[PDB]
Design a binder for these strands. Sequence first.
RNA 1: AAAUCUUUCUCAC
RNA 2: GUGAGUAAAUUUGG
Lengths: 426, 417, 512
Amino acid sequence: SQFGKSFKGRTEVTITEYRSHTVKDVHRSLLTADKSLRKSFCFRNALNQFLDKDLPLLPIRPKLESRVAVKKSKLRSQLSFRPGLTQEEAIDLYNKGYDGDSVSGALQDRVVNEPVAYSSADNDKFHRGLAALGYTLADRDTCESGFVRAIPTTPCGFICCGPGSFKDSLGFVIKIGEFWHMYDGFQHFVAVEDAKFLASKSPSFWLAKRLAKRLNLVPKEDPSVAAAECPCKKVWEASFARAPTALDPFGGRAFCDQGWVYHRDVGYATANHISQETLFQQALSVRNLGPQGSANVSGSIHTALDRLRAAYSRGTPASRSILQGLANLITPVGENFECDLDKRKLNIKALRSPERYITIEGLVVNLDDVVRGFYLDKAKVTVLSRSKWMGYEDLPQKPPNGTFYCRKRKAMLLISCSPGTYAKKR
Amino acid sequence: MDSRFAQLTGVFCDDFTYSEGSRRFLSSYSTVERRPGVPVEGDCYDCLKNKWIAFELEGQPRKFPKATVRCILNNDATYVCSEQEYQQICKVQFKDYLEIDGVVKVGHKASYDAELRERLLELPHPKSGPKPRIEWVAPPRLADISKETAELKRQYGFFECSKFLACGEECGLDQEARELILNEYARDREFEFRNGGWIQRYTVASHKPATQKILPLPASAPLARELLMLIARSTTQAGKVLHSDNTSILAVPVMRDSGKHSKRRPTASTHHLVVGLSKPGCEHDFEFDGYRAAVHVMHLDPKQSANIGEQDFVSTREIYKLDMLELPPISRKGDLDRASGLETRWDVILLLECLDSTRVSQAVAQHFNRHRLALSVCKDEFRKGYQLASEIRGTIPLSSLYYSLCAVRLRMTVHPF
Amino acid sequence: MWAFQEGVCKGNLLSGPTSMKAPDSAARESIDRASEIMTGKSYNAVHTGDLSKLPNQGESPLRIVDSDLYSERSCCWVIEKEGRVVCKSTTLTRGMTSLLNTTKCSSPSELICKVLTVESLSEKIGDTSVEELLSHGRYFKCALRDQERGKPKSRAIFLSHPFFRLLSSVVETHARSVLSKVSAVYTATASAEQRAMMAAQVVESRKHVLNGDCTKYNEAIDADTLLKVWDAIGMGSIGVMLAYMVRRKCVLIKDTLVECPGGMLMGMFNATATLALQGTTDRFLSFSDDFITSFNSPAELREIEDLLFASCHNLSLKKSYISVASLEINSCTLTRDGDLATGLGCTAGVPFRGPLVTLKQTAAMLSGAVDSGVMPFHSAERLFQIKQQECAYRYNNPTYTTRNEDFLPTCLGGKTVISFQSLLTWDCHPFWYQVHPDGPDTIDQKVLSVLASKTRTRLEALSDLDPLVPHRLLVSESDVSKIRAARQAHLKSLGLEQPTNFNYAIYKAVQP
RNA sequence: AAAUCUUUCUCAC
RNA sequence: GUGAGUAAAUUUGG
Ligand SMILES: [Zn+2]
Ligand SMILES: [Zn+2]
Ligand SMILES: [Zn+2]
C-alpha cells in the first residue's frame, strides 16, 4: 500500500515521478574514502574477488598504434561524437530480455567537447590524452583512405578519389521531386518522410540508415512507397567533380544538389570537417547544393539565417555566394528552413544591430567584415602597443592570424581575419 | 501525440473486444495497453483491422503518418471519418460532450494578474543609488605589498615558537620515548583515561576566539608527508598514540563533561586535539624520565582533519617545481636573507598551506594572478584585495596569509615582472 | 610557490576550503547587504536600460521539463499546522510529490495549467489555493556551500519551495531560449574554455580588453528587474507571480524568519539576469557575473561603464582589470591570438581518495593537461610515476591488499609502475584498464557506491521499461503491477531470469 | 582546553 | 524535568 502513502490523494502519477521515488537512497558517509575502503576490509575483499573472478573474463582491448605528425596551435574544442543505439537495435535488445533502463540510456547520441591545442596536417581527431603524441582516432584500402581525404594523393578515376563516376563500393542518396533515391549499384530504393519516420521498402539498407541519420528520422518499413522517375542508373554511370573537402560529420561528400556520396566502409568522419583554414572552402563547395546540416551553429539557427540574410542584402556577388554557402552549411536537411537567401523574407530587426556575428563550430565570423572583403581579400590590423614584446616574432610579408612585431611601425600588431589563414590559396 | 487527447482516446476504447476476449482498441497513452517494442503512429491502434486512428479538430492537422485514419472533430458537434465504422463508434462513444481543453500559452494572462500587479506596485522598490567614479591606474607596486605585510605584522606580531609547524621536523626521540612523553603529557593535562584511550573533557567555553599571532618558520619540513598521513589516520584512530617511521602524534577526542551520564565515545561531530612533539627550546617543553620535548597542540573538527589528511605534499611540490623560478633563501619571518636564509623554508610554507583548512593562500594566489596579468586597475580598490585578514580567524590561517603576502613581495623583489 | 611560477597560476593544486560553521552568519550578511542596496546607498539595483527590442515568446506553448523538477537535492517544504509556518528540509522529489498531493494533479504541467486557469486567488485547487501557494512559495531555507577555492568564508545557498522551483524552471527555460535568439554570441550552455575561445575571437578588433566581474550580483538583481525582463519576453502571469514571490521572500535562519525584499537570493535566475544586460546592448560577451568586453578609447570605456551601471551589473572594482596582452573569462586565460596562456593555469591537484580512483583521477587530470599545452608529455609521465610512488607509500599495507602478483600496482603489492603513454594507448595488463580515464570504473568506486547504497517500505519496482514508452504517461498501482507481470511473463517465455545487464561499451566491442 | 554558539551519544517516563 | 547505559569512528594504515 506504499502507493497510497507516497502519492496520497492521487490514483495516477507520471512514470518520471514514480521512477524518481524508486531511487535507492545514498547516505553521505562522513568518513574519508580511505577509512571507508578499510572498513571491514571491503576493498581488500573486492580486490580478491576481482582478481579471482572478474579479471579473467575481461576482454583484451586492441593497442593504439596509428600516429601522425602534429604541431602546437590555438586552443580548439575537439568534438567527439559517439552515436547511440538505433531504434530498431534498441527494440531488438529489449525483446531479447536485456534491461530496459540500460538500453534506454544508450539510445541517445552523445557529443563531447574537449580542449586541445595540437593540429595535424589532415585535421585529424586524437585519442583522449594523446593529442600531443599524434595518436589519431582514424585507422589506416587505398580508395577508403582517399575518400576521407580532402586532397587524395593518387586519383583513381572514380568519384571517391577525384573527378569520375561511381565505383561498386560507393553508394549515393539523392532527392528527386518528393522522394529520396538510394542507389548502391546492386539495389535501388526509395524513401519518403511521413511525419517523423523515413518510410522505405528496406529500412535495413545501409544507404537507408545513412539517410535516416542525416534527416534525423526513425526508419520505418512501408511496402507501398514507389516513385515515377528514376535516373539513378544514368547518375551512376555519369562523372561528377569531387570538391576538395573533408567528409561531413555524417561521413558523406556532396556531389550535386541535395545529393551525397557514401562509402560502405567509411562509417563516420574521424577528422574535423570544419576548421578555421577550411571554413570558406567548405562554404563555397556547397554554394548551390542546398541545405547540408554539416556545421553546428551556436545559438538559434533562425537567428543565424536572419543575420546571413541581412548581410546578404548588401554585398558583392562573391560575398553573396559565401553567405549562401554558410547558410547551406548550417541548415539541417529536410527541415522547415528557408536557407535560400533569395526567397527568405528580410528581417528589419537584423539590420538594426551594427555587427552581425555568427558562431559556426566555435568559429566567430563577423558577416559585415565578410561583406567588406576581410577574410578573403585583406586582413584586419589592430595596434596593441608601441613597445616591443619579448618572445614575439616579426611581422611577415603576408601575415597570418596572430600577434607580431612590426619594425616598420615599431609596434605590436594583432592580425585577424587574415586571408593567409582563411583563404590559403595553396 | 498530444496528452490533450489522452482522455478522449480512453473514451473511444470502451470495453470493445475482438477475437472472443482480446481488447480491440489499444490506447497509445495507456502504459498497459501499449504494445511493447512497437513505435506509435496514432492516438490508438485497432488490432482487428490493424490500423492506427488519430483524433483531430477542424483545421488542426496533427503530425502522424498519412496512413493513420483521422477522425475529424467538427466545430459543431459532429464527427467525420473516412472509415464508416470508426465514424459510428465516435458517434456512440462521444455521447457526452468531451471538449478538448485548449493549449495554454506561456504568456497566458490569468484573471488575478491585475491584482498581483497592484500588490507588487504597493510593495517597496529600490532607490537609484550612486554611480561609482572609477579611476584606472597601474597595479600595486612592491611598496604596497610591503606595507600590507608590515601592517599585518604590527597588528598581530609573532609567536616565540613555531607551535605545531615545528612538528614538521624530528623531535629527536625514539618511538618508545615519544609514546611515553605523549602519554605522560596527556596524564599531566588531567585527560580522562577510558577503554585504553585518552579523552579531553570540557564544561564551559569563554565563547571568545583564541589568540592570533604569526608563526615563525622552522628550518625545514622533512616530515610533511608523515605528519599529513598521521593526521589522515587520526580521523578515526583517536585516543591512542599513532606512530610513523620518524614521528608520532596523539589525537584526543574533545567531549563535554555532562557528569555521571556523559559521552564515552566520539561521534560524527566530535572535535580532536592533535598533540605532536618537536625539539625542545620553547615554553611548551615537557620533561619525563629525562626525555625532553616540546608538545604542541592543534584543535580540529572532522572536516578540517579530513581535508588536511587528504593532501599530497610531494605531488604538489613537483607540479609547482615544473615551471618555477629560482626560490630565494628566506629567514624565520619570511624575509629575503641571502647571507643566512634557507630555501628549504619554502617547503615549510607549502606544509602550512596544507595545514590551513581555510586555504586563504588560494585567494591570495588568485588576486596575484590578476595582478600579474593586469595593465590597469581601479584606484584604491585593487590594493584592497590582499587585505584578507577579516575573512579568516586563527593562528594557522593568519600565518598562511602573512607568508602568502611575503611570497608575493619576494616575487616582486627578486623576479620583477 | 605559486607566486614564483613563470606563467599564470591560479593556485588550485590544493583542495578547496572546508568549514563546519553554521550558515546563519553568511545568510544574515547577504540579507543585510541586500537591504543596504535597497536603500540605494552602495550599489545600483534600479534597471534603466531599454529591453523593448527583446522578442516576445508569449505565444509559445507552456511546456515543462518534468525531469528537472525531480532530484535528490534539498528543497524547502512549508506546512501550516496551527497558524504557524514550519519550514522543513526535504528532497526535491519529496517536495514536488507533496505539492502534487496537496493539489490533486497528475503532473506538474496539469498543476501549472490549473493555477493559470482559476478565476480567483481564493479558488481551491485541492487542499490549497493560488493565494496559499504564493504565500508558501516565498519561504526559503539557508544552507552553506564550501570547497570553493579562493573563498575562505563559505558561501550561503538557499533552498526554495517546490512551487517557486516549478515557475523558475519555465521562466529560465524561456530566458535561455531568448538568449540563444538575441545574444550576439550565445554562451549560456558553453564551457569556460569555449567561452574564452569565443571571447578571444570577438575582442580581436580592439586594443584594450576589460576583464570584468560583478560584485553583489545576487543582491542587486531586484524583483522589479526580473519582472521587467519577463514582461519584455512575455512570461505573462507566471512572471508576475514569480516576481511577487521574490519580492515577499523570507529566509528561515535558525528559528527566525527574516524578510529580504531586496534582490534575489542566489543564482536562481542566471539567464534572466544575463538577459537584463544582453537585452540592452551587444557589446558584452557575458553570462551571470562575468563579461569580457573590449574597447579602443577612454570614451568607449566610459560608455561601457554606463551600460553596466544601467543594467544593474555593478562592476567589481576589486577584481576587474584591463589587459592588452591577454583575456580571461570563467578563470580561463588566453593570449590575444587564441593560445592558452603558458603556465599551470587552472590545473588542480588530486587528493588521496583510494588506491585506484586516485590514479584514475590523476590520469584524467594529466590527460587534460597534455591535450592542451599546459605541460609536455614527459612531464606528465614523470608526474604519473611520482603519483604511483606516493600511492605505494600510502596504500601498500595489509589493510588494503594481500596480493603479490607482478602485474598489480606497487600500491596493491605488485611490482609494476605503469608508463603514462603505455596506459593511455591500451598497452597494459587488463587490470589497468580501470585506471584509464575512459576505462571502466575502478574497484574503489564500486566498493564506495555499494557502501553508500547499503543503508522502510519500497514501492513496487518500475524498472526494465520499454525504451519507447514516454516517461510522461500516467500509471497507477494496478498499471505498475500489470506492466511488471507482463514483462516477467515475456522474460520467462524466453527462459530468462531477471533481465541481463546491458553494457553499451561491451556490446559495441562485440559488434565487430 | 582550542582554528571558540562549535567540540550536542543512546534509551525510558 | 528525572533516571539509566555506554549501536555508532578505535577493530585495521609506520
Ligand atoms: Zn578511389
Ligand atoms: Zn532512383
Ligand atoms: Zn612551543
